[PDB]
């Protein structure tokens, strides 16, 4: 459990490394969604006993977007947070500092977009992506107007929650939804999270074109809850990527954060996905 920190052209990024290496395996690098950090986005999944079993054989690098780590300083007023693109550009710095040369990326939401942009810039450093709730397109003008409309009546935490969880789940108001409403609404770093939320909303097209110049050349597992906020964007994305190397796990009963509600199944899917690329898992 070693924490590290590196400098990049866009300020610094913090990450945490687990396991002792395996020089002949990629590293599993995770990047989390808006409103969360490694600890609230991915820790329950990576500490699930079955997932422990499988990753025994890999080094893990868990990244916290700038400003998101436990105990981060609040950026100053008029601070100028990196765009999703610029966040993807901070990854070589991490990899360099560690001397890893290849990864399997696991992201959620913004984290998924980030790792996918990273893959486009450095395809030979990426052996595979697990992309949960990816929305690979800029916000359309209808979405923007709808977004600003909602914004007149939802606080920002409410809006971030609406990105992470489905509306059903929100009224459902389960124990987890309460927890998360709390982590997000009372986050000491709430202003930091807001900037990331902006970066996210302002993202550009990835332009995946099936059999075009702009695709992913590594195997990809897409993941999304049924009837969750990003199902359509994920479905659409599946239609733009190479079918030979892209599976699509749409999970019944998982909601917006399948990795928090279905660690069991997602862990199993991860096992097959690794087998899929020829790693005994």
Curated annotation (Swiss-Prot):
Q: Where is the signal peptide?
A: none
Q: In its keyword annotation, does this UniProt entry include Acetylation? A: yes
Q: Where in the cell is it found?
A: Cytoplasm; Cytoplasm, Perinuclear region; Cell projection, Growth cone
Outcome reported for the amino acid change (mutating residue 149 to D): Decreased interaction with CTNNB1. Abolishes down-regulation of Wnt signaling
Query: An example Gene Ontology cellular component term from the record?
Result: cytoplasm
User: As annotated in Swiss-Prot or TrEMBL, what is the tissue specificity of this protein?
Assistant: Highly expressed in brain, heart, skeletal muscle and salivary gland, and moderately in kidney and liver. Expressed in dendritic cells, but not in other blood cells. Expression levels are low in pancreatic and liver cancer tissues; absent in meningioma. Expressed in low-grade gliomas but present at low levels in glioblastoma. Isoform 1 and isoform 2 are present in brain neurons and up-regulated in Alzheimer disease (at protein level).
Keywords (A to Z) from UniProt: Acetylation, Cell projection, Cytoplasm, Developmental protein, Differentiation, Neurogenesis, Phosphoprotein, Tumor suppressor, Wnt signaling pathway
Q: Provide a GO biological process annotation.
A: signal transduction
User: Which family is annotated?
Assistant: Belongs to the NDRG family.
According to the record's subunit comment, the protein's assembly and interactions are: Interacts with CTNNB1.
Instruction: Please give the function described in this protein's UniProt entry.
Output: Contributes to the regulation of the Wnt signaling pathway. Down-regulates CTNNB1-mediated transcriptional activation of target genes, such as CCND1, and may thereby act as tumor suppressor. May be involved in dendritic cell and neuron differentiation.
- Can you say what this protein is called? Protein NDRG2
The organism named in the record is: Homo sapiens (Human)
Task: List the top taxonomic levels of the source.
Answer: Eukaryota, Metazoa, Chordata, Craniata, Vertebrata
């Amino acid at each position: 459990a070693k924490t590290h920190s590196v400098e990049t052209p866009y300020g610094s990024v913090t990450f945490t490394v687990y396991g002792t290496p395996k020089p002949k395996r990629p590293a599993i690098l995770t990047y989390h969604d808006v409103g969360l950090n490694y600890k609230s986005c991915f820790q329950p999944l990576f500490q699930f006993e079955d997932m422990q079993e499988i990753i025994q054989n890999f080094v893990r690098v868990h990244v916290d977007a700038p400003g998101m780590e436990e105990g981060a300083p609040v950026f100053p007023l008029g601070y100028q947070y990196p765009s999703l693109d610029q966040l993807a550009d901070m990854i070589p710095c991490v990899l360099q500092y560690l001397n890893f040369s290849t990864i399997i990326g696991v992201g959620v939401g913004a984290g998924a977009y980030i790792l996918a942009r990273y893959a486009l810039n450095h395809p030979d450093t990426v052996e595979g992506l697990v992309l949960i709730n990816i929305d690979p397109n800029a916000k359309g003008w209808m979405d923007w107007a709808a977004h600003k409309l909602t914004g007149l009546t939802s606080s920002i935490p409410e809006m971030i929650l609406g990105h992470l969880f489905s509306q059903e789940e929100l009224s459902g108001n389960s124990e987890l939804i309460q927890k998360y409403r709390n982590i997000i609404t009372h986050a000491p770093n709430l202003d930091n999270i807001e900037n990331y939320w902006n970066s996210y909303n302002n993202r550009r097209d990835l332009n995946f074109e099936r059999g075009g110049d702009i695709t992913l050349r590594c195997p990809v597992m897409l993941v999304v809850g049924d009837q969750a906020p990003h199902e359509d964007a994920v479905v659409e994305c599946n239609s733009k990527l190479d079918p030979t190397q892209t599976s699509f796990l749409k999970m019944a009963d998982s909601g917006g954060q399948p990795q928090l509600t279905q660690p069991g199944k997602l862990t199993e899917a991860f096992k097959y996905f690794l087998q899929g690329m020829g790693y005994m898992a």
